[PDB]
């Protein structure tokens, strides 16, 4: 469908992101048979929402649970809600959610990281209390996005195995809410912003107003109307603009009005006037070459598996700001929209990424990745859908300068191309206004990768000197430089190293500057930087990883992934100061001149 | 060469192990060419001996060095040693040494864990200073024990590669001593103990008098002669037994007197009256069921690498005693003989092991492990040769109950059985008195493993739950039991678990009791224990490792190896208390009731 972001004015929100909900596991999978949504959840403990369910109770068995869990909550419809359009929305429900308003199934969703909502007007009475039961599923398979394989052992007990390097946290990770609109309501806006050598431009609009004529006005930061439009559908605005720019992100405001004969609806959409374009080996923003700095991030913290939190967001952005990061990539799933609102407001450049990681069977059972058994026509449709829902969500955020379709598919087999070519094309139809990318795994190098020509920007995840040439900066450096030059000459695209990093145990110090030591982390990033500055095609550097985060258990992960610049409690490792010096020492948004 | 532990009676030694020798790297491999041994090493620096050269200087470039290093030292010969036999002895020089005394090449050795000695009387003048120069080589190859491959880079320098987990520390690891003897002397002995039902029984001497007759009296701990023979070549002695027992380890003393016309050489040996053999599923200590507790250990410590150190030895034994260890294995190389005197004297049980580890290519470039390319006849000789020298050294140490011919060879390839059958043969003949073993890796399991039948005791290194069934105690327990039971069937041989362990970060704590957490170590060690007990065949437990220790760099090793019950600075992890409680809550040398 269509997704607008709930704002208040004529339209109003009840939070119900009030956190305390009833919660129980459904170990027997009785829940649907017995219609638990029909009465109060039995044997139910208190849980916080928004939040992962896994870590809230410090219990291994709830953490490692695979299958169905139930959230239940009673809530009060505002009396004043009367005959307005009432909508129940979930910003996210991890992997799968099915929702009941009082023994009435109102919605269903597969996707752990984007919103789903249903008009509930007919199913609720204003001034009365309703029971809300969500059945949440955390299972992955070959058609889920990201993919996985549940293994049931001989006892019929499920266990989730998956192919990506973060932990499969689940639950209601983001805001759930009740919200209002008039029976005439704006429900889709699409803004495209053009700029022409930065003295003037046009901002096209496209508007869907469920039964309403629309009018448009564009306002300053200091709230004065600078352009108007009728053409309630397709209306183009000309301006002497304050451009939304990486440093500051100046935001205009577009007010969308849906008028019925008796009814009004008012939707304000923040707009940054900026162009994004690749020209040759450059990534241009408002027609200037940009240089990315900053991180691949995760949504991860102690006690919240991936649950959204405002303090964590305020804090992490103070860190990213302090360190001189100008960008990030929503590694491995769409992030909370609050994050993109922040980025828009603060002029943070973002690479927006679907949840399509784990397409790889060689990261470290089926023998063909592209297979009817394993990655197939159904998967591709699920993949396209994931792309659709992400673009439908994030299309108007000026902070998003690029779409990332997938992280680290195995592109060696013939068929990778078969599978990805249509997604690349589809994606571009969905959004013509942004470069497109597919993040690239180390072993699909310049000579073996089959897919990268189909996208606009080259985003490489590189670990030379870590997973390969381990401990050896000297030969690490040679392989890295040779690889990046090969890519440059092969594709003549802008290259962003979207991942480079080494596990570092905070407090592990070594005179020998060897693996897993603060000093090795320092020397290794430093060597990588030396190379980047020698390669003109390199247009960006995003360190892996903002902070330590949880993964599945194994021999390769010491209590988790330790490639953070900060620890999970947001303590700086000495590499944090190193990056601070490089990033705050550069000219903003500008690439070093390959010397101090 | 004939091998006797120098001791002080009518015989004298001056340790040159007084530590400060002059040291140099020969990066240019000029050393031999220019007879560096003829003049003071230039570009020299002070180094301590006994100790690894690698970590003494906090320099990576020295730590990772492969090739020849030069040790030089001047020493005033004592005036009272003038027409006496003078012997220069190195208890160990890691990998290879070439020794000169003032431009006089005196000795050469391959094998980093056993002594080598030569008479220097002709090349040295008593009351004068002579210059000692040593060429130490750390390079390993296929002919070497343990094996390795050395690669010369595209730039021209050497880098070592090897297949055993611990770090390749090299240098002069054990003491060097000048050594005195009469012109007629003892250079060999051998003793055997027979004890039938702990009634009085006999000790057969066999000796080598280098031109003398011997009187050979046995003394009690009170120097009270309780038996005598004059047959300097073969005897027997019989009295009410007084057993060398694992509890306290009582010893007798055998004066070996060797007579010439002008000179008498009294050599003293220590003797522990005890019996070791297998009956079916049981390892019997003096005809009585023993159950092993204690560790796989290494020679590794903070700044000395594998260099011997008395304080470290005193301290480690305090800890093993405290924790209830009765046994350990000289992991993957033979230890400093001081360790074996301690075990003899305190009655500790020792599974003695050669340096033959890393025969395997699957632990984590040649096609066939046993082949001209990889392991060949030549390699089988050195293996033999290494086994010769060990038994030559430790044959008389009562604490040694059993030989471990090697650690973790891959027996799946073709020829594995052909390789080990003859070496098994040669060893049984070399010491008929002690049982013999080969320590077995996880992936050569009961059904897959060849070559388990040629050995008397089954020594298993098992990791279920940690490398496989990663983090899963429940399945790991079943696999382990079925595995161990499957082992009682194929053979009804005594089973000792020589390694069972999990990497654990001191200070990593988890409510989820997951991998690399102090808790997990406890839970996992606990789990092996419940299984261990149920198997009648299980004669012992030896935890991997005693303490954290260095390894070559890689993504699987964080500090180095972290499976230590103690950290490298000897601080206990919570699992030290788990073991303490079991190993002292037992009856000594006995098995638990397969229940409390
Ligand atoms: O293994 C890593 O450290 C990271 N490398 C990658 O290439 C992946 O894109 C990341 O998910 C992963 O966390
Ligand atoms: O990897 C380990 O935890 C240990 N397991 C083994 O089987 C080896 O005998 C040891 O060297 C090694 O350190």
CB distance A60–B554 less than 8 Å?
no
Rounded-to-integer distance, Cα B195 and Cα B352, Å:
22
How far does A563 lie from chain B, in Å, by closest CA?
12
Helix (H) or strand (E) holding B477: helix B473-490
Q: Are B77 and B26 in contact (CB under 8 A)?
A: no
Query: With the C-alpha atoms ordered B216, B217, B221, B223, is the resulting torsion angle positive or negative?
Result: negative
Residue ranges of the annotated binding site of A are: 165, 407, 461, 467, 499, 544, 563
Q: What is the resolution of this structure in A?
A: 2.4
Whole-number Cα distances in Å, A107 to A67, A133, B103 = 19, 11, 92
Helix (H) or strand (E) holding A63: helix A60-63
Instruction: Please report which residue ranges of A395-509 form alpha helices under DSSP H.
Output: 416-430, 473-491
CB distance A512–B555 less than 8 Å?
no
Rounded-to-integer distance, Cα A299 and Cα B424, Å:
58
Rounded-to-integer distance, Cα B125 and Cα B78, Å:
9
Note the Cα A159 to chain centre separation in Å: 26
Instruction: Indicate the angle between helix axes A337-346 and A377-394, nearest 10 degrees.
Output: 50
Instruction: Give the per-residue SS3 of A578-595.
Output: HHHHHHHHCCCCCCCCCC
Is residue A215 helix, strand or coil? strand
Rounded-to-integer distance, Cα B435 and Cα B427, Å:
10
Q: Where are the beta strands (DSSP E) in B155-217?
A: 158-162, 176-181, 185-193, 201-210
- CA nearest A103: which of A79, A72, A127? A72
- CA nearest A144: which of A391, A355, A440, A367? A355
Compute how many other C-beta atoms are within 10 angstroms of the C-beta atom of residue A154: 5
Structure tokens at A520: 């090795």
Sequence-separated (6 or more) residues with CB below 8 Å from residue B585: none
Closest-lying ligand 1 atom to the alpha carbon of residue A164 = 11
Domains recognised in chain A with CATH numbers:
1-182 (2.60.120.260), 183-275 (2.60.40.10), 276-596 (3.20.20.80)
CB distance B58–A512 less than 8 Å?
yes
Sequence-separated (6 or more) residues with CB below 8 Å from residue A422: A380, A384
Residue B213: exposure state from Cβ atoms within 10 A (0-12, 13-18, ≥19)? middle
Rounded-to-integer distance, Cα B11 and Cα B85, Å:
9
Rounded-to-integer distance, Cα B420 and Cα B450, Å:
10
Q: Where are the beta strands (DSSP E) in A3-115?
A: 13-14, 21-25, 45-47, 68-76, 85-90, 96-101, 105-110
Q: Beta strands B349-353 and B327-330: pairing type? A: parallel
Which residues of A lie inside 8 Å of B (Cβ-Cβ)?
58-60, 63, 153, 466-467, 470-471, 475, 503, 505, 508, 511-516, 553-559
Cα of A550 vs centre of ligand 1, distance in Å, is: 12
The answer to whether the CB of A304 is under 6 A from ligand 1 is no
Which residues of B lie inside 8 Å of A (Cβ-Cβ)?
58-60, 63, 153, 466-467, 470-471, 475, 503, 505, 508, 510-517, 553-559
Query: With the C-alpha atoms ordered B98, B101, B102, B104, is the resulting torsion angle positive or negative?
Result: negative
Residue A8: exposure state from Cβ atoms within 10 A (0-12, 13-18, ≥19)? exposed
CA angle B459, B463, B467 (to 5 degrees): 145
Q: Beta strands A85-90 and A176-181: pairing type? A: antiparallel
Chain B residues whose CB is inside 8 A of the A58 CB are 511-512
Q: Beta strands A96-101 and A129-137: pairing type? A: antiparallel
Rounded-to-integer distance, Cα A267 and Cα A593, Å:
45
- CA nearest B405: which of B416, B420, B393? B420
Structure tokens at A360: 């790889």
Q: Are B326 and B588 in contact (CB under 8 A)?
A: yes
Helices (H) and strands (E) in chain B, counts: 8, 30
Rounded-to-integer distance, Cα A269 and Cα A251, Å:
10
Compute how many other C-beta atoms are within 10 angstroms of the C-beta atom of residue A584: 14
- CA nearest B385: which of B570, B116, B586? B116
Q: Beta strands A21-25 and B282-285: pairing type? A: unpaired
Rounded-to-integer distance, Cα B385 and Cα B381, Å:
6
Sequence-separated (6 or more) residues with CB below 8 Å from residue A381: none
CB distance A505–B63 less than 8 Å?
no
Residue whose tokens read 């689940």? A170
How far does B60 lie from chain A, in Å, by closest CA?
5
Query: What phi and psi values does residue A171 have, to the nearest 5 degrees?
Result: 115, -175
By annotation, the residues of A acting in catalysis are 408, 499
Where does residue B175 fall: left (phi above 0), alpha (psi -120 to 50 degrees), or beta otherwise? Answer: beta
Note the Cα B201 to chain centre separation in Å: 30
Compute how many other C-beta atoms are within 10 angstroms of the C-beta atom of residue A67: 18
Query: With the C-alpha atoms ordered B572, B573, B577, B578, is the resulting torsion angle positive or negative?
Result: negative
Residue of A nearest to B303 (CA): A511
Sequence-separated (6 or more) residues with CB below 8 Å from residue A582: A293, A324, A529, A592
Q: Are B473 and B528 in contact (CB under 8 A)?
A: no
- CA nearest A132: which of A2, A1, A17? A17
> DSSP secondary-structure letter at B503?
-
Rounded-to-integer distance, Cα A106 and Cα A98, Å:
8
Compute how many other C-beta atoms are within 10 angstroms of the C-beta atom of residue A233: 12
Is residue A340 helix, strand or coil? helix
Which ligand is in closest contact with the Cα of A564? 1
Residue whose tokens read 């029909």? A38
Closest protein CA for atom 13 of ligand 2:
B165
Closest-lying ligand 1 atom to the alpha carbon of residue A442 = 7
Choosing from B561, B562, B564, B565 the residue with most ligand 2 atoms within 8 A of its CB, the one to mutate for a pocket test is B561
By annotation, the residues of B acting in catalysis are 408, 499
The answer to whether the CB of B499 is under 6 A from ligand 2 is yes
The answer to whether the CB of A483 is under 6 A from ligand 1 is no
Is residue B361 helix, strand or coil? coil
- The DSSP annotation for A38-50 comes to GSPPTT-EEE-SS
- CA nearest A498: which of A283, A262, A242, A244? A283
The answer to whether the CB of A353 is under 6 A from ligand 1 is no
Helix (H) or strand (E) holding B15: strand B13-15
CB distance A555–B470 less than 8 Å?
yes
Whole-number Cα distances in Å, A467 to A515, A521, B154 = 11, 14, 21
Whole-number Cα distances in Å, A428 to A384, A388, A471 = 12, 11, 41
Choosing from A162, A163, A165 the residue with most ligand 1 atoms within 8 A of its CB, the one to mutate for a pocket test is A165
Structure tokens at B244: 């060398």
Structure tokens at B378: 């030549």
CB distance A516–B556 less than 8 Å?
no
Query: With the C-alpha atoms ordered A532, A538, A539, A541, is the resulting torsion angle positive or negative?
Result: negative
Whole-number Cα distances in Å, B365 to A479, B161, B369, B373 = 21, 12, 10, 10
> DSSP secondary-structure letter at A12?
-
Instruction: Tell me the residue length of chain B.
Output: 596
Residue whose tokens read 């903070």? B302
Compute how many other C-beta atoms are within 10 angstroms of the C-beta atom of residue B54: 27
Buried b (16+ CB within 10 A) or exposed e, A319-344: bbeebbbbbbbbbbbbbbbbbbebbb
How far does B55 lie from chain A, in Å, by closest CA?
9
Whole-number Cα distances in Å, B7 to B16, B78, B92, B268, B335 = 15, 17, 17, 8, 19
Choosing from B544, B548, B555 the residue with most ligand 2 atoms within 8 A of its CB, the one to mutate for a pocket test is B544
Q: Are A452 and A491 in contact (CB under 8 A)?
A: yes
Size of interface A-B (CB pairs under 8 A): 70
Of B63, B514, B553, the CB nearest to A515: B553
Structure tokens at A588: 């903003």
CA angle B246, B249, B255 (to 5 degrees): 145
User: How many CA atoms does the CB half-sphere of A204 hold within 13 Å?
Assistant: 7
Compute how many other C-beta atoms are within 10 angstroms of the C-beta atom of residue B83: 9
Rounded-to-integer distance, Cα A509 and Cα A516, Å:
9
Closest protein CA for atom 1 of ligand 1:
A165
- CA nearest B579: which of B329, B327, B324? B324
């Amino acid at each position: 469908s269509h997704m607008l972001r709930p704002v208040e004015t004529p339209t109003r929100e009840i939070k119900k992101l009030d956190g305390l909900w009833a919660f129980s596991l459904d170990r027997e999978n009785c829940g649907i048979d017995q219609r638990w949504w029909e009465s109060a959840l039995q044997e139910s403990r208190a849980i916080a929402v928004p939040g992962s369910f896994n870590d809230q109770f410090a219990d291994a068995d709830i953490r490692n649970y695979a299958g169905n869990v139930w959230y239940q909550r009673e809530v009060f419809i505002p009396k004043g809600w009367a005959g307005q359009r009432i909508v129940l929305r979930f910003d996210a429900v991890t992997h799968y959610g099915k929702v009941w308003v009082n023994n009435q199934e109102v919605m269903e969703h597969q996707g752990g990281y984007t919103p789903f909502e249903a008009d509930v007007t007919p199913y609720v009475i204003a001034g009365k209390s309703v029971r809300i039961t969500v059945c949440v599923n955390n299972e992955l398979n070959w058609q889920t996005i990201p993919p996985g394989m549940v293994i049931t052992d001989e006892n019929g007990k499920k266990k989730q195995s998956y192919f990506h390097d973060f932990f499969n946290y689940a639950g209601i990770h983001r805001s759930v809410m009740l919200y209002t609109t008039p029976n005439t309501w704006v429900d889709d806006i699409t803004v495209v912003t053009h700029v022409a050598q930065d003295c003037n431009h046009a901002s096209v609009d496209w508007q869907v107003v469920a039964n309403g004529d629309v009018s448009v006005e564009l306002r300053d930061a200091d709230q004065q109307v600078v352009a108007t439009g009728q053409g309630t559908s397709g209306t183009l605005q000309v301006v002497n603009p304050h451009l939304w720019q990486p440093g500051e992100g100046y935001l205009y405001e577009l007010c969308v009005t849906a008028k019925s004969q008796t009814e009004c609806d008012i939707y304000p959409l923040r707009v940054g006037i900026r162009s994004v374009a690749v020209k040759g080996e450059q990534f241009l923003i408002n027609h200037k070459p940009f240089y990315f700095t900053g991180f691949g991030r995760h949504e991860d913290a102690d006690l919240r598996g991936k649950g959204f939190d405002n303090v964590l967001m305020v804090h992490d952005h103070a860190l990213m700001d302090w360190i001189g990061a100008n960008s990030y990539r929503t590694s491995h799933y769409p992030y909370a929209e609050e994050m993109l609102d922040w980025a828009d407001e603060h002029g943070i450049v973002v690479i927006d990424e679907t949840a399509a990681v784990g397409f790889n069977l060689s990261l470290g059972k089926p023998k063909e990745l592209y297979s009817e058994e394993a990655v197939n026509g159904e998967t591709q449709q699920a993949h396209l859908q994931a792309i659709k829902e992400l673009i439908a969500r994030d299309k108007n955020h000026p902070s998003v300068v690029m779409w990332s379709i997938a992280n680290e598919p195995d592109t060696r087999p013939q068929g990778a191309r078969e599978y990805f070519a249509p997604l690349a094309e589809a994606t571009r139809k969905l959004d013509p206004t942004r470069p497109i990318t597919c993040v690239n795994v180390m072993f699909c190098d310049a000579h073996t990768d089959t897919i990268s020509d189909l996208f606009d920007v080259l985003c490489l995840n590189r670990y030379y000197g870590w997973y390969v040439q381990s401990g050896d900066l000297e030969t690490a450096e040679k392989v890295l430089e040779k690889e990046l030059l090969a890519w440059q000459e092969k594709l003549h695209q802008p290259i962003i190293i979207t991942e480079y990093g080494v596990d570092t145990l905070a407090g592990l110090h070594s005179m020998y500057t060897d693996m897993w030591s603060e000093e090795y982390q320092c020397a290794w990033l430093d060597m990588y930087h030396r190379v980047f500055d020698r390669v003109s095609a390199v247009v960006g550097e995003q360190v892996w990883n903002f902070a330590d985060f949880a993964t599945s258990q194994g021999i390769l992960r010491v209590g988790g992934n330790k490639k953070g610049i900060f620890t999970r409690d947001r303590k700086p490792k000495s590499a944090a100061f190193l990056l601070q010096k490089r990033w705050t020492g550069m000219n903003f948004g500008e690439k070093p001149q390959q010397g101090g």
